[PDB]
Each structure stands twice: as C-alpha cells, then as structure tokens.
Design a binder for these strands. Structure first.
Ligand SMILES: [Mg+2]
Ligand SMILES: [Zn+2]
Lengths: 162, 72, 222, 175, 141, 96, 45, 38
RNA sequence: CCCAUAGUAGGCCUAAAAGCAGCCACCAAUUAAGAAAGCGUUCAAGCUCAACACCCACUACCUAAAAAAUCCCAAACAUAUA
C-alpha cells in the first residue's frame, strides 16, 4: 500500500510518501474468466451484511468506502457491498473501523439499542404514528432491496417490508 | 458632426495609378488560386487535409450551438 | 483526440408557407341542431386514423383516450407558435376542430325533462393518434422539450415522439411480445374462453388483448 | 491591465467612450490623448486605428500603435463610404486582387500578424474573408473588365442607393 | 466480453503521423520542453522570440506521438513524454540563443532532446553549447 | 488549479522543483510544476519565483519551498501524488 | 533496430566504443601513416 | 426554503443534497434557490 | 477536471449599440476557439458553454410519494430444503 508520513524537526516538515506491504489475490481463483472479484470468486448473490470478512476488504481504515476504479467491482456489486457495509456499520459490526475524531466519543450517547439490517440512517426516520388502513399499511423496511436476488433456501422469499 | 469620410475620387483609373501597383508578371503565381465566391464543402474536401477537419469541426460547433438553446 | 462525425445535413426538407398552427374555432360554422348521445366508444381502444407521420418528422403521440376542447387547442397552439422557429420549423394539426357537441343541463336541475341544451364542442382522441406534427431543418431535442411541455398539459397521457422513436417503440413492443417467457397470454385465454373468462371480460377485449381499459392504455401489458 | 479600443488618429477628445473607462482605471486622460495625437500627427490622413493600452501599478501607461482597420482599407480601395445593407445578395463594388495584396503587405507588419509565423497567403485569405463579410466583390483579373464594370456599376449603384435612400425616406415618414 | 471491434485509423492521426515523421527525418535536432500553463499573449511572445532566429515550434498529442517513439529508433525519448510536453523543430542547430532566451523564464525546463541522433540531457545540452566553433573544431585536425 | 488562486499564494517567497525526466516516478512533481506555474497562482504575487532544477543523475523527484516566515517545507514527491501534496502545501501556507 | 541507452556525463564513466575501435586502429603507428592521414584527409578540404 | 415535488438547480451554484431523508436544493450564491422536497 | 489569443469595436441600422436590442452575410491565423449558445453589460467590461493541448471510474435502471375532526390499530417476523 501507500502512506504519507509527516516529520516535523527543526522548523522543517519532511513530507514523505512510502510504500508498505500489500496483499495479493489467492493463487487459484475458481472462475478466472469473471470480471468482478465477486464474479471471479463465485460470490455473486452469496454474501450478506454479516460477511464482514468479505466487506472489510473494500473499505477504508475509518469505515469509508473505496471507489470502483480501485476495487474492480461492477456497478451493481458496488452498490450491494456499500449498502451491506452501511448495515454492518449500523449493526455494531466493524468495531475497529470507527470514524476518526479527537475527543468527541467521551459524551456517550443513548445506550446500545441493538439493531441489524438497518436500512435508513437511524437519526432521520420519523415514527409511524398512523399506520394507515389494512389495505395500505405503512410498513417498516427491513433489509435492503438490492439483496433481493440472493440465494434463498427457505422456500419463501425474504421479507423486505415487515 | 463626426463620421469618417475619406472618399478618394475613384475614376476609371484612379486606383490603378494612385498606389504603385506593380505589373501582374511580378507578383507570384500562388496568388491566383484562391477560392473566391463560395467556401468549399466537405465532399470537395479531402478527409486527409487539415481544412477538412477544420470545416467538420465548424459544422460540429454549429450543431452544438443549434442544440444548446433549451438545455440548461 | 475525440473522433468527430459528419453533421446530419438538411438539403432535402422544404418548409411550407404559413408554418404556424392554424387557428381552431370552438364551434363549427354550421352548428348542429340535433343532439347526439355520448357514444363513449370514440375514445376507447386504439386509434385507426392519423397513426403515422405524413410530412413531418416529430409529433405529439397520444397514449390514452380523451376529449380535446377549445382551451386545450388554444393552449397547444399558443405554446407551439411562441416556442417554435418559423424559419426552420413548421407545425401542422392532426386533430379536427371540435365537432362533438357536449350538452349540459341548467345548474341546480333535477333529473328528467328531456336532454340539455348543447353547451360546447370537443374533439375525441384515441390512444396511438398523432395530435400535432412538426417538420423542418431541425433536430429532435428542442422540439422534444417544448412538445413534451405541451403534451404534459393534455387531458390524456401523451409523449413527444419522432419517426425513429416511434419505430423503436413499436419494434420493442414486438420484441417483448415474442420473447415473453410465460406461457399464459391474455389473448390466448380470452380467445379460447379459458376458465370461462368471457363472463368477466368484454366483447371488445378480444381485440384489445388486455392492453386497453376504458380510455386508458397500458404499454407494458403485452 | 489592458484596454482594447479603436480611436481616430487625428481626433481623440477626452470624452466617451475612452473617458469613463480610463477614469475608472485611474489615469489622466488629457495626457494620453495629447500623446496619442502627437504620435499620429506623422500620418497625413487622420486614419482611425485600434489601440492597445497597458497599465501598471504605479499609474503610468504604455500604448502600442497597430495597423488601421481592414474595413477602412477595403472601403477605401472600393471607393464607397458605407457598407452594404444586404451582404451576399447585393454588391458593394469591384476591387482587384492586387489591392488586397498591397493591403496585406502593408498590414502584416502590425501586432496581429507579424507576431505569428503567417505567410502572406493566409493573410490575404483573411482579408478576402473580411471583404466577403463587408460585402465587396473580388475576382481574378480586372484590366479591361474593371473599366466597363466601374462604368456600369457606378450608375446602377447610384440608382440603387438613391432607391435605398428614398426607402429610408418613406420609412422615416411612416411613423 | 467478446473482443471489441477495433476501429480504423482516421485522416487526422494519419497525416499527423506523416508530418511528425517528416519533421523527424528532415530536421537536424529536436528540443523537447514542458508546456507551461502560461497566458496566450506571452506564449506567442516567446513563440515570436524563438522564430525570430528561424527555428519553429510545434505541439502534438501524446496518443499519436508515443507509437512513433515505440516503433522507431527514438525509443529512449518516450519516458520523458509523460506530461504537458511540446517540441521545438529547429533546423541549422543553434542552441546559444535558445538557452539565453529560455533562461529569462526559470520555470521552462528543457527536459532534453537529440543532437544529430545524439540524445543529451539539459546539462548535456549546455556543455554541448559550450563547444568551440565548428571551423576551429574542423581545423583542430 | 483554482484552489491556490483562491487561497492566495502570496505568503511564498521561493519554490523549486527537482526531477529527472528520464525517470518513471516524476509525473507528480512535473504536473505540480505545471499547476504552480499557472497564470493565476503566479500572478497572485510577483515577489516570488518558481525554479525548475533539471538533472539526470539525481534519480529522485523533490520539492523545496520557502516562504516569508523562513520555514522550509520539503516534499520529496516521488510516491506522493500531485493532489495530495497540493492540498498539503495549501494547508501549510494557510496555516502560516 | 535500436539506439544507445544514452546516459549523462555529469558523472562520466562511459564513452562510445566506436571511437575506441577507430583509435586503436589508427593511433598505434609512427609518422609514416600519419603522413597518409595529413596528405589524404585534405583532398576534400 | 420553498416546498416542491420536483427540484431543479436554478443556477450553477445550486447543489442537491440528501438530508434527513429528504432532497434539498441548497444555494450559497442565491439563497433564493433553496428548495425542499415535499 | 482544464481553457478562451486574434482581421474584429464583421459590416448595416442606431447617440451608442463591439457575439450577445433588430436583420443580412457567417468568411477567416496560428496545432485551437462559434462573425457567438446561455447570462451579464447604458455602451463597454468582467463569467461560462462550444474549441486544441491533459488524462481519461460511472458519466446515470426516465418521471411516476400529501393532510380532519372520540383513540394508532391484531401480535410479530428478511435466512432447516413444495
Ligand atoms: Mg466575455
Ligand atoms: Zn443557485
């Protein structure tokens, strides 16, 4: 990889860009004819928001996302991975990819409202005060619609609004 | 009043003698090949020549100007 | 370098005299004395007239049935005549002047006592009929913009189309029809009276093929 | 900064349009006009001619004199005063290619053509284009053609210009 | 995806190749330099200051400059052409006044070039410029 | 390159860029010379000069900048990219 | 074909070898052939 | 802020942002252009 | 994401109308920039866009949602095989 290190010594700031170690691909990917890493490793429709081992290979050291021109993902898999990583961030997963901040974590907010498959940003969704009639109820989005094509073993489709 | 009026008395031979025009045999020959009346067209022009691409680009600019009247 | 392509030339298109839209009168010169019934079938189903381009290359295509009246005519004519270029574009009507008489009874009237007096006139329009056509030495984008402007204000669904656009829509409809993957078709079931479905369907559904519902047209219905 | 304008050689009065722009620039205008006029006193005609003016922080100005206008030179070689109203459909006069060669050889030493590596061919092409825009007409050889062409054209153009002037007359009457 | 249908070469790049080959064959030496993002008026000011001694300048796209460098004998010129680059086509090789008129602007780098098929760096160019007069060099032996 | 034009490059008094054109890792500092020799970034103040030191045996891109307060900011950019060192230099000049 | 790698002379360590070959051919003899050099090189000069 | 069902930038300095589950058009040059989705 | 030199303040008309008040023409230099597409200007000027040079992630599945009066309204739940 690459990094920038700044050394202040005697009113002189040395700015250096150094190259560090980098992990390569595994020796024998199963489908070398594929285009995306997901297609190459046959992971298409085979990963969820729980697969942090797969998600964290596409994300910045501070919980951010990496661009497609670097990762190599297709447009569809990029959106799938980005939404999955948002849900993983909101689910309390990825503890070491927290946003960087000098001292702002000391005023701890509301305690651990445990949650998962969180689609929207928790601080921007209004309560459902009226719920509508039986034939049109205001449902609650659970999960992401961009994972509707994942492999299903339950013989019943995944429920996205419940 | 003020408006530029310097109108030399152009007679049948005024501008043939007011300035020292040299005989036709003394000017170089490359002067008498210019396209005078109409400008030349794409089909007349060779896709290899640079003026071909200049004219094609002028047509492209005209098309862009025509189209870009309602697009913000 | 960016590769360049020749501009589409216009040396075989001649604009006619009087290029702006003709004034449309609200009522016929000879008013109709006899009052006719509301034969609602003149806006039902597909249009059989004015479905193809005649002289222009752009148009407003109706995607649903409805009645055009003088307010609509004035709106479209004024917007077109104030938004087009007389020297390079010409616009031609494709719907007649309002001729169908709509009668209404006096306000606060009980039911009965004959029909009402003729109040105004309308032009029936079916889905798939071109309403205004446009031609000249211009591309499609400017006319598409200021014609979708007009089409959004029509009493029915409408779009701004061109020759190539309309041909593309028709070819895509045929392609969808042939590559449809389920084996159960409205046409097949309706024509074979499968499940006795004609007790729910209409005699017009044998020809509408499920694509038309009242004065509404579904272009994704196959 | 720079100032782009055209002013007559022997006539530059401390007023509009150079007045307000130079006043907003912040430099004396009488000194500039007197200096310019005394520079161009060496011209025996009083030829309008463009001027590039450059200013520096210490409130003094350096001015570069160029060549006169191709519009002026072409209308002078044509012998007409005003440009044609209907360019392309109406002819403003007749000139020969020797005149445009002379104009090019006398103009190419200005700041807009001697600053580049332009042959006289591209310069005369530019002059021919500006002539077409002006509406004047250029053909190949005019030894015996020009004399008869001038003979007929002076009369027909005087008649047509009188027609245009009376056109302006009834237009000004019908208000 | 199946192999792309390759395009055919256009007249622009074809004649660009022709003229670049012509000026690489007929000329004596070439001086490449960096295309400073400098104003147009001053840019033509230098352009005229260089042409006043009868030496020309040109600018060409890299996407057509590179293949000539790769497939010709001038391969070693390629790795210098990674940015905003221009070339000075100059017959009757004269370097003294070029260096003198480039020294006024210290941000114009002469990244190098060839001198009768002899490619030298910037300091190479300066020490080649410092070479004695050609009649003296000829008469030395 | 409008970032420096808006940030007012006027604190600086001298900048110099050293590189070898015949080396593969000089593009960043070369295009930094390009963006720092721009008309606006240089016309924001006419009391500072830009220097293009050209050598062949150095084999290393480097940048050395000195401004009014006497501080010497050196960034030997051969792995460090143009935009990164650009925003670093801009941040340094706006801090001081 | 190809061209020489062409290094710099601010740190001079290498020089073209065609010069070495020609000098090894010409510069190991007495005045007998130096007279040939002097008489002959000036036929065109 | 003005409520709109369709939002469009009225100048080059208008920018669309997605905040509090809504689409806003924010302009710093002309605060006149501030629009909020409804 | 850059980049805006020129015949030229193209002529006519206009007090002035310079690409941008209205029309006719729309050539033409440099490797590149339209007798000018948006503004903007009293006229100018200062801004873009169209143009070389510079690399080039996509440069976009089109749009297609709203509030009334006593008190929301089953509880819930995305992943063990038709
Ligand atoms: Mg401007
Ligand atoms: Zn705005």
């Amino acid at each position: 990889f690459r990094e920038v290190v700044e050394t202040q010594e005697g009113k002189t700031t040395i700015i250096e860009g150094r190259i560090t170690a980098t992990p390569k691909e595994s020796p024998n990917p199963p489908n070398p004819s594929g285009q995306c890493p997901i297609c190459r490793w046959n992971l298409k429709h085979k990963y969820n928001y729980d697969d942090v081992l797969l998600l964290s290979q596409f994300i910045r050291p501070h919980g951010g996302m990496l661009p497609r021109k670097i990762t190599g993902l297709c447009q569809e898999e990029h959106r799938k991975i980005e939404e999955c990583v948002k849900m993983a961030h909101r689910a309390g997963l990825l503890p070491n990819h927290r946003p960087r901040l000098p001292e702002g974590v000391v005023p701890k907010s509301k305690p651990q409202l445990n949650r998962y498959l969180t689609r929207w940003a928790p601080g921007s969704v209004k309560p459902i005060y009226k719920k509508g009639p039986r034939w049109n109820r205001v449902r609650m989005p659970v999960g992401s619609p961009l994972l509707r094509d994942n492999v299903c073993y339950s013989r019943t489709p995944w429920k996205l609004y419940h | 009043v003020q408006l530029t009026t310097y109108a030399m008395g152009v007679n049948i031979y005024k501008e043939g003698q007011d300035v020292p025009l040299k005989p036709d045999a003394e000017y170089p020959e490359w002067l008498f090949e210019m396209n005078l009346g109409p400008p030349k067209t794409l089909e007349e022009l060779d896709p290899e020549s640079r003026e071909y691409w200049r004219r094609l680009r002028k047509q492209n600019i005209w098309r862009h100007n025509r189209l870009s009247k309602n697009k913000r | 370098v960016k590769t360049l392509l020749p501009v589409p030339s216009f040396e075989d298109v001649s604009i006619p005299e009087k290029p702006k839209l003709r004034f449309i009168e609200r009522a016929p010169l000879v008013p109709k004395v006899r009052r006719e019934p509301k034969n609602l079938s003149d806006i039902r189903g597909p249009s059989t007239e004015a479905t193809e381009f005649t002289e222009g290359n752009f148009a407003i295509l109706a995607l649903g049935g409805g009645y055009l009246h003088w307010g609509h005519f004035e709106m479209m004519r004024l917007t077109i005549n104030r938004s087009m270029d007389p020297k390079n574009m010409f616009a031609i009507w494709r719907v007649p002047a309002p001729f169908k008489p709509i009668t209404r009874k006096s306000v606060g009237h009980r039911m009965g006592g004959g029909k009402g007096a003729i109040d105004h006139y309308v032009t029936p329009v079916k889905a798939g009929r071109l309403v205004v056509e446009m031609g000249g030495r211009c591309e499609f984008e400017e006319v598409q913009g200021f014609l979708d402007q007009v089409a959004h204000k029509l009493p029915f669904a409408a779009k701004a189309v061109s020759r190539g656009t309309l041909e593309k829509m028709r070819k895509d409809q045929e392609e969808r029809e042939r590559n449809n993957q389920n084996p159960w078709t409205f046409e097949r079931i309706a024509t074979a009276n499968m499940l006795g479905i004609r007790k729910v369907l209409s005699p017009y559904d044998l020809t509408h093929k499920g694509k038309y519902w009242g004065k509404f047209y579904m272009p994704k219905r196959v | 900064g720079v100032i782009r304008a055209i002013v007559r050689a022997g006539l530059a009065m401390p007023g509009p349009p150079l007045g307000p722009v130079l006043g907003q620039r912040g430099v004396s205008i009488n000194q500039f006009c007197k200096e310019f006029n005394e520079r161009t006193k060496d011209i025996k005609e009083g030829i309008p001619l463009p001027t590039k003016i450059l200013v520096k922080p210490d409130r003094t100005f350096e001015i570069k004199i160029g060549q006169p206008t191709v519009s002026y030179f072409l209308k002078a070689a044509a012998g007409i005063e005003k440009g044609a109203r209907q360019t392309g459909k109406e002819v403003a006069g007749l000139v020969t290619l020797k005149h445009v060669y002379e104009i090019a050889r006398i103009k190419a030493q200005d700041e807009a053509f001697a600053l580049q590596d332009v042959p006289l061919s591209s310069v005369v092409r530019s002059i021919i284009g500006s002539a077409r825009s002006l509406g004047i007409r250029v053909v190949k050889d005019l030894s015996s053609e020009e004399l008869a062409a001038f003979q007929k054209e002076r009369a027909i153009f005087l008649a047509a210009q009188k027609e245009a002037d009376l056109a302006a007359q009834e237009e000004a009457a019908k208000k | 995806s199946p192999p792309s249908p390759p395009q055919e070469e256009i007249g622009l790049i074809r004649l660009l190749r022709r003229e670049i080959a012509a000026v690489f064959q007929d000329n004596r030496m070439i001086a490449v330099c960096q295309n400073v993002a400098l104003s147009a008026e001053d840019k033509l000011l230098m352009r005229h200051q260089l042409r006043k001694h009868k030496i020309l300048m040109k600018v060409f796209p890299n996407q057509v400059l590179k293949p000539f460098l790769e497939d010709s004998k001038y391969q070693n010129l390629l790795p210098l052409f990674v940015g905003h680059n221009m070339l000075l086509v100059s017959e009757e090789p004269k370097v003294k006044e070029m260096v003198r008129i480039l020294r006024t602007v210290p941000f114009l780098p002469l990244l190098g070039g060839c001198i009768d098929d002899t490619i030298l760096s910037r300091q190479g160019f300066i020490n080649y410029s410092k070479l004695p007069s050609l009649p003296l060099v000829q008469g030395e032996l | 390159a409008a970032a420096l034009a808006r940030l007012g490059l006027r604190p600086v008094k001298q900048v110099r860029v050293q590189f070898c054109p015949f080396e593969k890792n000089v593009e960043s500092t070369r295009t930094f010379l390009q963006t720092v020799s721009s008309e606006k970034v240089r016309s924001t103040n006419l009391n500072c000069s830009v220097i293009a030191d050209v050598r062949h045996d150095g084999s290393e891109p480097c940048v050395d900048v000195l401004f009014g307060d006497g501080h010497r900011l050196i960034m030997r950019g051969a792995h460090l990219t143009a935009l990164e060192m650009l925003t670093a230099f801009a941040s340094h000049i706006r801090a001081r | 074909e190809a061209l020489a790698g062409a290094p710099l002379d601010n740190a001079p360590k290498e020089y073209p070898p065609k010069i070495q070959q020609l000098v090894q051919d010409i510069a190991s003899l007495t005045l007998l052939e130096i007279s040939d050099l002097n008489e002959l090189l000036k036929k065109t000069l | 802020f003005k409520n709109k069902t369709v939002l469009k930038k009225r100048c080059k300095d208008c920018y669309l942002v997605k905040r509090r589950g809504r689409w806003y058009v924010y302009c710093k040059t002309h605060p006149r252009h501030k629009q909020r989705q409804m």
